[PDB]
Amino acid sequence: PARYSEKGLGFEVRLRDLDAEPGRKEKEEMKRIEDFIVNTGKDKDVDRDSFQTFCK
DNA sequence: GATAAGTGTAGATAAGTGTAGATAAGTGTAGATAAGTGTAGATAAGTGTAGATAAGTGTAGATAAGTGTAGATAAGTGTAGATAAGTGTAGATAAGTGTAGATAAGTGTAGATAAGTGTA
Prior knowledge:
Protein name: Portal protein
Shape: globular
Radius of gyration: 13 Å
Helix content: 25-40%
Order of helices and strands: HH
Number of helices: 2
Structural class: mainly alpha
Keywords: connector, virus
Distance between the termini: 16 Å
Name: Portal protein
PDB class: virus
Strand content: under 5%
Number of strands: 0
Entry title: Neck and tail of phage 812 after tail contraction (composite)
């Protein structure tokens, strides 16, 4: 995720419209979806592929 | 205490100025050509005059800008339910402070050598 990467390089989950401002729950849902992608799943599990292994 | 910077003193040459003569700058004077102006005639700028075409305006008809009017879809708002932001509450570890002993910063104190200044 770019969110945690100070150089901004990575991926992000975003609202579609550039003009919208995200609601209080939407900002958290977007962070959850980012985390889900990183973990490739709901829970953390070292036995599962990371997103890096998936992409490779 | 020992030498040589620093100044007064004495003589020898050539800067510095007045004086006298020889040539050519500087000015007045006389004559010869051509600048400078008035004068007379020939051509074409400059203006008024008369006719010929097409700018410039009013007039009449044909199409489509411009507005009011009627119906169909979906912006815009209120209303009802479902999940998870947001806050209070209870327990577990380790920040944060006071307290006790060991080492070495920090200061006073005593003696030896050499800048520090006067003197010959």
